């Protein structure tokens, strides 16, 4: 007696995509195949692609609207960033205060990341105990010594370090320099964050992490040259992974200029030539996962010139459909690879054993996608606190019809959000 | 209902080994999971590991041979072409072969065409028949025939498989040894040095790249050899490679004590080399393990090492010996074992129905009993000639069942329960 | 005191070219500097560049030529020491007997000095020690050619003898077949000839030889590299620490396929002359110090063998007399290469690679071998200026911006632009131990 | 007539060493060879090696004392460091004052280095105009922005940047850590400055210099791993050179433990196995020059444990003889290579056209060395302000007999310092 059965969809399995049925029980995938039998309920995925359901390894979060946007965007598990939050997630005390405040607002599931900061190097073991899945840092921030000592510690606890990689110093200087000269266009901003500032940062961190004996994950890589640094170190046998985001694949500096401060983000959006290289890296399997790096903010902060506007891209709701359209539909990527880049790889890298793949025993988390079905994103579609996004006015070639988490539909393109917040925090041991 | 359900076994799935059930219908995997229902026949695999049947990409052959394969846990073999009298080099060549094999296949068999110096014009023929690749030796082809042939294959969307050894240098060093009276196993190995393999691989890698042809490097014997393939792959070239159990479980000292039965072309090198190979295998630099089964009449195996015909009769020992050595002795995960013994080969050669325990694939399995030993004896062998360098070896795991397309074709208890039901596999 | 003093010239020393005087005594450089004293004879080189005489590491003397004519062509071209190839002449230089015969024949015919190379062939791997004993400075082979085993075994022995192996690197089989394929299709064009000798045939060959020689433990010298991809292999191998050097020739720097198509069979040679883009690459490699020396690979030929279409024609460039001035013009004048670099590439590097201790260096104690070059002074090469047995060359008709005015060998002027050849032949064979 | 002729010496020429005479006129080498004729004076160098005077590209100065020690040590040209001086050589005024303060004190010639500090990247042109031969900087120190900004300017001026490459931060933290746990041993000190702190810094600087478009010279390399980093970069086509010092070739950590604080220096003296690798690097031409990094100090600051004592090696007077003995005599290095490592390469790298080479038209700067003639270094032999050195007690197998600058003997092992100081500053253009 299965609780649910999803029939006739083109299901994305690890090796291939094929039409098979999925049986669900207790919120977990009970079986996969044909003539599964009877279930309390049945769903018809005919004409739909049933994907595992994004695992956004780079999410900044309020919980109610954000998680809401996530589900709508086909995201069933997010990995919450530690800093950029009221109390910074740096130890048990701080994270438990965060849990309490979130009680009942989670529409999707959430794994957690601890923050590696200049002052909690001796409390790292606390968040490891709690069940965090990794630690984030910027090289607030830590110096080379604190990074080395913190990484050495993380390596011993069996935790990976996640790093934002840019020489902030040279960037801020070039930026201010651009201020004094009156060059505040999207192109001036981008040039104040040249590729070498990313590459030098990546090289520094790769080396120190290696000597510290710590596994490393390079966040949002914006250039092929940055990707190349990650690949060469991996071929040397070092334990590292990297990720990028939809905006580095679907946007370029010219469009950034046209769009405005809404397309402004830390690692900047480079020119089309850079983008073509990124696409080559992606298809070559050199970028482990795609993440949103969703960074929302009050519109009052996105006001002013590019140079003084707050950086960050609000696109948590647009990752799955845009990438399915651009990657699979537009560029012909295989469906299984799409599943890997949006969910499986992140799940494996961060040890979310129950997530990221449609396989027996895993959580029944899915996203139903309607290929060849366009629409133009508009402000009123967004579920964000503030209905603004650099993707508004964009033609998206596919649609998310259903989003299922642990066996229940939490988002339906026709009935909206059918149930009460069903999400839970995920803590690993 | 399902024709069969295999219950409670530790199943080797794609990224994980799991205790789940497998339902089969019409020689196909119908479903995987729990609470599958019922079937005509039910098998309890409790305590057993259920692996995808081995896909041996390097087999030299049918009655005896396919029976040994089945008993060894091999459900699909990829048959070599330059062994048979009429060599598989064209349509009429392979057609004759199909007819003569009539009713002798105990397991399924994919096919390779031969790329020889005189058939570069007929390659498309075998391509049309449906072989999954072409084998060649650099009967043998010169650099020109190889470049010319590879270029054609690359256009046909076919990979070239290559025996990579500088034969000239190997032959001369051996002849040299004959002269000096050096004829032990150690002299034989020293007459087939690592550089003869490396030079050959480097040469073939470059020409295949220029020709625009996909390449698979056969039986690599040294980490140095593997290192060349890895370098090329990182440069973006489409190359894969294989090795054999004899390069991981035997070393020169054992070859010396065993005799001519452990004498093979790229030679079994010393223990240090072996350690390097295990390092490469665990690092995932060797795509698959293959038998390179090459039997022969004992008369040709008599004489000193230098004299003896080279070849390892080990088609029946590939699966259990590697499971024991890799998984039991060295801790390899079950999923990786499955990839190296079956999945990678299927993906490399496009055998979409094989090497994967997944929905819709052929129901080909081998049941392995972990921590259960026996000593391989001549009696146990299904080969035409009951000899093998593995005879007398203590193996810590046993094959209890082999299933091909839903049917048990080998049972540790019954032997061969059904008439040969294997089929040739031709891909289009 | 001194026998000769060359005054006021711009002398190419090892690290700089500068106006300084040179004193000579007993065929050797006695001193270098200012106010050297006086000499039996004084030459005024004001306005001229005084360079070390070229050391041609790749010379073929006859398939028609001979010591008399080729050696005079060399002197007129500014070459004072040639390193003779072994497998061209009829009695191939493969052992004691064959070289001694060669010597007896060349008696009194040498206008310039000549070091010697032995040949590594399939049947003399056992005799190699003989030429080493005589004193050749290296062994040449084509991979009568040697198969991979013969090359490996021979290089191993040479490495034991402390002798370098020089190799013509081209996958001949593929080249021949591709050539026969252009033939069948009626494609006998220069551009077609070049295409039947694609870059990968040179790269595959260099790769194979580099590896085998490394395993044989033998020092290697790659002959006439025609493409930057070929040079890149050598550089990579040297950066891995392998003992190897390589050379190229002026035809791969001053001619391209289009000019080759215009010139005809006289511009046909084994590694083919690639296109202009390939040439650009070669200049970059040369200026970057990745090509150790420039050599002629002078390969004279009877006019009957150069007749007909490009595929049928005998390959080989006759340019022994044009290496120095052409390259001085192209490299130093047109491209700005420093004079000392020019000296290294045309003389010093070859001398060092082959252990010619008395040559290619204008420094105290070395042989007084010089060539006087008149810069920014052009002339047009004509068949009549050629000293070869057969007066033809793809460089005929070329306007060269510098001229060789004098060539001095061991203290004596052997070629003078106003007088011709002043003295009877006095070159000697150079045998090293 | 020639003013002087040195006869019968084994002269180190560029290509080889041989017995030839050297003619001098007006302080310049007038000629080289045999039968040079007559001169006002004639020196017999029979049985001696005549080497070009050493060009020490890294010395810290006072002038009267340091210069005498230099001359007695066989050094004829030094390249003076800018920082860590009374006023710092960072601009016109600073160096101008320098010249006047040194008047009449120079026993040997001195080319000059300017400092690249945080407060003068806009004055760099001043020292370039005066004729400095390069600029030294650390990591006052400059941050990544100041380093990049200044190197960019230096590159435009055609000036090389010289850098002390160690991750200062991490070394200081590991050090404090040691003298917190009670580890104040020489072996503890070296461990507090691990090889990775030098590799990281070298990697950072190489890359930034590369992007800034500035020629770079890596100061006192202490490990083969560091040299390998420089070698890689050069093989990639970057204009980079590097140096090391005798103490990294002639001393190891055990000997340092034995000697005490006199052998304590910034990049630390590594273990014997590391020294082996260094010799290997030196022999295959991966290290352009050998410099002294002479750094004397009051013996007061050398009291106490290794952890709190001042770092610096007083060995200006012992570079030539110790290296001649170790490299050539003990290890079989050819004389022409010895000359390049001790003089020619430095001269070429820093444009000292008249120095480092025995060739026509160059300054008549030489040092006469008596091979296989030993002695034990004594405090008394030292000409330093403070007669102390980690080389005291050392058996040195060759001796400096005479030092000649611009044709005049300024040091004689039997007469001492015969002439009044005749050294001059060298400013290039
Ligand atoms: Fe960030
Ligand atoms: Fe972020
Ligand atoms: Fe084989
Ligand atoms: Fe085989
Ligand atoms: Fe040739
Ligand atoms: Fe030739
Ligand atoms: Fe320093
Ligand atoms: Fe210093």
UniProtKB/Swiss-Prot annotation, chain B:
EC category name: hydrolase
InterPro entries, per database record: Allantoinase (IPR017593), Allantoinase_bact (IPR047604), Amidohydro-rel (IPR006680), DHOase/Allantoinase_Hydrolase (IPR050138), Metal-dep_hydrolase_composite (IPR011059), Metal_Hydrolase (IPR032466)
Induction: By glyoxylate.
Keywords, comma-separated and alphabetical: Hydrolase, Metal-binding, Purine metabolism, Zinc
Pathway stated in the Swiss-Prot or TrEMBL entry: Nitrogen metabolism; (S)-allantoin degradation; allantoate from (S)-allantoin: step 1/1
Any one of the GO BP annotations: allantoin assimilation pathway
Enzyme Commission number(s) from the entry: 3.5.2.5
The organism's place on the tree of life at top rank: Bacteria
Keyword Hydrolase: yes
Binding-site positions, Zn(2+) 1: 58, 60, 135, 292
Gene Ontology MF: a single term: allantoinase activity
Posttranslational modification: Carboxylation allows a single lysine to coordinate two zinc ions.
Task performed by this protein: Catalyzes the conversion of allantoin (5-ureidohydantoin) to allantoic acid by hydrolytic cleavage of the five-member hydantoin ring.
HAMAP family: Hydantoinase
NCBIfam families per record: allantoinase, PRK08044.1
Miscellaneous section: The zinc-containing form utilizes only the (S)-isomer of allantoin, whereas the cobalt-containing form prefers the (S)-isomer, but also hydrolyzes the (R)-isomer at about 1/10 the rate.
Designated name of the protein: Allantoinase
Organism expressing this protein natively: Escherichia coli (strain K12)
